Design a protein around this nucleic acid. Structure first.
Ligand SMILES: [K+]
Ligand SMILES: [K+]
Ligand SMILES: [K+]
Ligand SMILES: [Mg+2]
Ligand SMILES: [Mg+2]
Ligand SMILES: [Mg+2]
Ligand SMILES: [Mg+2]
Ligand SMILES: [Mg+2]
Ligand SMILES: [Mg+2]
Ligand SMILES: [Mg+2]
Ligand SMILES: [Mg+2]
Ligand SMILES: [Mg+2]
Ligand SMILES: [Mg+2]
Ligand SMILES: [Mg+2]
Ligand SMILES: [Mg+2]
Lengths: 78, 252, 85, 202, 56
RNA sequence: AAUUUAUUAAUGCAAACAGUACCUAACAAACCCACAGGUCCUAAACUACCAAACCUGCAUUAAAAAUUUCGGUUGGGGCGACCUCGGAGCAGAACCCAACCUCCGAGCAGUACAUGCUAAGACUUCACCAGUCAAAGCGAACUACUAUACUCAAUUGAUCCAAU
RNA sequence: CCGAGCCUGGUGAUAGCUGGUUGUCCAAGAUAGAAUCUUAGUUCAACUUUAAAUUUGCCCACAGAACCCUCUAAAUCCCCUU
RNA sequence: UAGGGAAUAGUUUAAAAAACAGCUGACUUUCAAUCAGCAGAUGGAGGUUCAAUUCCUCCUUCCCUAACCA
């Protein structure tokens, strides 16, 4: 009985695996495209702010907060 | 699980009880545990006492229920008021409800469903500037900002989402209130619930049905099988001592 | 009279330790001897007397190696001599 | 009693030989001290009557302190040995059927002693015309004195009582003892009013 | 002996075989999900971090 | 200094040993009732205190003691400094080579997630322990990212035991 | 001979430390290191001795063993023949 | 490390409020105080629900309690 249960558990878990990989691969691609978005936007905003004031916790915090609010304001509309 | 609250729950369970009269004809009550049980016999007995202790044929049966209103998890549930009409509503007439709705079609739905007091700013200002008494209040979400003025006045009796008294559909509490009878809660939160069931003249079967309805009504707050919700039940008339009902069969 | 390891750890110090029984002075009545005796006893002795249904049964039933008392053996001889005579 | 066990294994000695004990076998760990065990009750058969239990021949489970320091030394109880159980059991049969008279139960003796020294305040309302009958009077034992009286047992003065006054109720406890209690018919006062009026005031 | 910048974690196979391997990840980064060869099923399967063994 | 409280004193709990007490904040708004008070709009539920010592067991805190130790290198010892690992010179060309000799470093980080499995033949810090490199093969990868024992110099810790 | 008496016993205490260790004759026989509360000692290597097995040992011809860097050193390693 | 608990405005509390600080001012020689204003928050992520400080889940930080032996 123990052997049959372990084999059944593996079989069931391994029939789902092909779809799981598809989801995982897409998440990696999605994370690659999110990092690029972050790499771009954070740097520009933070860089400009630092150059103006002081040539940096306050400014970074503000930009790191307002951007979140903009996403939330869209989520509030949803 | 605070020691006092949980320990009392352990203690109240401990209180012994017995079936049937002891063999002895005359026995001191102290020498034997509580005995009288069956809900049918209990109602019949309460009628017997009414005759012996000359009193009104019709009296309020103020059933007090030691309902485990706590210990769902080690975190305890809280006191609410699940309002439902009994199968045969007793002859008491109660039609007191305040509805807050301003410049909305709900004003019509409020009065259409039998609201006693319906109004907006004018009604809110009356509550703050002058004394007025209603049993329960309801408000639509749009008026909650304005109603916040009466939060302090009502001392947490103002409508709250927790009691399902904030919502576009007012009839949650409004409609059912007149026929419905409120399951109020203890002030000391010792879990005993004083809830009238029936007038004494109501037939035993009708009172028995009225009892069962409350059993489901009270479990509504925590109808989980995780924690037993009922411990003891005392069916008392106004001018009589409480009798320990055998509520275990009727619990589920 | 024995030894113990401190904190029940064999790697710690070994200490001398004596466990003494709790002693009680109680009065008992012997039916065969029709006399009352004040004797120092333990709670075990009281339990054994209860299981024997009295002092006389306890004294007569209990073997010498279990009584562990010269006085107890003297009571046995007294009781047995009265029964024999 | 202290119960100990050895830390170190003792080598087997074999058949007909004594174990070889090294000085390491003197090291002991405390398994249990039996004085801390939950106390068990002592089963005794009563001889005379006691307030807690008093039916001669009743098998009672008492605290070992009570049985050993009071009941057994004084002769009020005996050990529940097979021999004693047989003797008391035989007596029970004779009481049920034979000449030996039936006796009150444990509760019956307690009630009789209470009923001997008690007065019943049968509060009756002024407004409604009332006639005192066994059933009504029986109710007042429960409310006032706390005694649960069967209606049939009560024997009233047999003179209809409709006026405040004093009378006598003859209570029969289990059919053997008849007690006559003083009866004080008084104007009924609700519990809250009576306690506030006098108990609080004085 | 230095600031703890990485941590050791146990990656557990999602095949239900129970085969596990230990990998090092940054403390601040999110839990690792990796495609790793599982000998029991003899093919690459998705693994998910379950526990943190120790701090590296 | 480490270890310890058996011992002694104090404290708590248990053990042992008596019983004592059982709990009161209305109010009629209407109506009844000569009063005194009642009907209605609750008149429920609920036991609480609790034995002084001596002795014994288990704990905690003190006192007073007990047992045991106080590393090495070193142009004498102490003081200072040093103690493991790697690169360079001394040691010019196979290997090896010292000084409290001369210099500079290490106690990681980063990328993989087949850093999977298995197996000829070898190297080796002068012993041992440990350490190092690997064909073929299985399974992968692959359609030319100097690709299948990652980059990196050192980047490190035996046995018992503990956790799982 | 009190930094803690004396006697007896455990006791032939233990001592990596010093001292001592008994007839004759012959033979082979000197010394890379590693670890160690270890450097006044040990264990493993190395050397040394005895017995046994079967096959090369020593001496060495060419050819051959790195750039970076200054003394472009005396030499070494490998090695048939003999 | 183990579980338990916790996370609210710059700060500290409450069931989305008050208090202080910042205060922009007014008034005090100066400064405090005082008065009136004004900014200000539900650790992070994901999900349920029309709506989540108020349901759940994982992670970070901190506390508690117990470890931290070899
Ligand atoms: K010198
Ligand atoms: K010498
Ligand atoms: K030495
Ligand atoms: Mg040391
Ligand atoms: Mg030295
Ligand atoms: Mg020196
Ligand atoms: Mg020094
Ligand atoms: Mg070697
Ligand atoms: Mg290959
Ligand atoms: Mg001398
Ligand atoms: Mg010697
Ligand atoms: Mg020679
Ligand atoms: Mg060492
Ligand atoms: Mg040496
Ligand atoms: Mg040669």
């Amino acid at each position: 009985q123990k052997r049959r249960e372990r084999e059944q558990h593996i079989a069931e878990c391994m029939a789902k695996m092909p779809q799981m990989i598809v989801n995982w691969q897409q998440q990696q691609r999605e994370n690659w495209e999110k990092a690029q978005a972050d790499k771009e936007r954070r740097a520009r905003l933070q860089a400009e702010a630092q150059e103006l004031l002081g040539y940096v916790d306050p400014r970074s915090a503000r930009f790191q907060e307002l951007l979140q609010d903009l996403e939330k304001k869209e989520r509030k509309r949803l | 699980t605070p020691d006092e609250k949980k320990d009392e729950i352990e203690k109240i369970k401990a209180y012994p009880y017995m079936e049937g009269e002891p063999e002895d004809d005359v026995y001191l009550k102290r020498l034997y545990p509580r005995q009288i049980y069956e809900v049918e016999k209990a109602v019949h007995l309460l009628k017997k006492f009414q005759i012996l202790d000359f009193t009104s044929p019709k009296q309020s049966v103020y059933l007090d229920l030691t309902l485990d209103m706590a210990l769902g998890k080690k975190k305890n549930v809280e006191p609410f008021t699940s309002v439902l009409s009994l199968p045969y509503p007793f002859a008491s007439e109660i039609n007191k409800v305040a509805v807050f709705t301003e410049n909305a079609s709900e004003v019509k739905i409020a009065e259409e469903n039998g609201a006693a007091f319906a109004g907006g700013t004018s009604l809110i200002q009356k509550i703050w500037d002058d004394e007025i008494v209603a049993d329960f209040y309801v408000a639509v979400p749009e008026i909650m900002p304005e109603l916040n003025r009466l939060r302090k006045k009502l001392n947490k009796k103002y409508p709250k989402l927790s009691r399902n008294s904030i919502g576009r559909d007012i009839p949650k509490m409004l409609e059912l209130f007149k026929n419905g009878h409120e399951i109020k809660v203890d002030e000391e939160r010792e879990n005993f619930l004083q809830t009238k069931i029936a007038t004494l003249d109501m037939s035993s079967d009708q009172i028995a049905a009225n009892l069962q309805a409350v059993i489901n009504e009270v479990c509504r707050h925590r109808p989980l099988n995780l924690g037993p919700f009922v411990v003891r039940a005392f069916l008392r008339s106004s001018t009589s001592e409480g009798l320990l009902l055998k509520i275990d069969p009727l619990l589920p | 009279l024995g030894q113990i390891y401190a904190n029940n750890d064999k790697l710690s110090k070994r200490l001398k330790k004596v466990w003494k029984p709790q002693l009680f002075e109680r009065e008992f009545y012997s039916e065969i001897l029709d006399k009352k005796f004040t004797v120092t006893v333990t709670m075990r002795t009281l339990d054994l007397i209860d299981e024997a249904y009295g002092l006389d049964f306890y004294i007569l039933k209990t073997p010498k190696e279990d009584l562990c008392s010269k006085f107890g053996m003297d009571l046995k001889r007294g009781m047995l001599l009265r029964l024999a005579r | 009693t202290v119960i100990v066990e050895r830390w170190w294994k003792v080598p087997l000695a074999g058949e007909g030989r004594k174990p070889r004990l090294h000085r390491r076998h003197r090291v002991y760990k405390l398994v249990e001290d039996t004085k801390h065990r939950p106390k068990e009750n002592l089963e005794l058969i009563l001889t005379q009557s006691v307030e807690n239990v008093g039916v001669r021949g009743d098998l009672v489970s008492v605290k070992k302190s009570l049985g050993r320091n009071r009941l057994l030394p004084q002769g009020l109880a005996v050990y529940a040995s097979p021999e004693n159980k047989k003797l008391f059991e035989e007596e029970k049969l004779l009481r049920q059927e034979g000449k030996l008279e039936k006796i009150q139960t444990k509760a019956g003796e307690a009630t009789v002693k209470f009923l001997k020294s008690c007065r019943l305040e049968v509060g009756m309302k002024n407004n409604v015309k009332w006639e005192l009958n066994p059933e009504i009077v029986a109710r007042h034992f429960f409310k006032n004195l706390g005694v649960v009286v069967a209606p049939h047992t009560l024997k009233l003065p047999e003179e209809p009582i409709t006026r405040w006054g004093e009378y006598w109720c003859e209570v029969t406890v289990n059919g053997l003892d008849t007690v006559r209690v003083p009866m004080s018919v008084v104007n009924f006062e609700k519990p809250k009013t009576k306690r506030y009026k006098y108990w609080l005031a004085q | 002996k230095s600031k703890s910048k990485n941590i050791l974690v146990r990656m557990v196979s999602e095949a239900g075989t129970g085969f596990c391997f230990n990998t090092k990840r940054n403390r601040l980064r999110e839990k690792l999900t990796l495609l790793h060869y599982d000998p029991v099923v003899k093919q690459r399967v998705l693994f998910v971090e379950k526990k943190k063994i120790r701090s590296l």
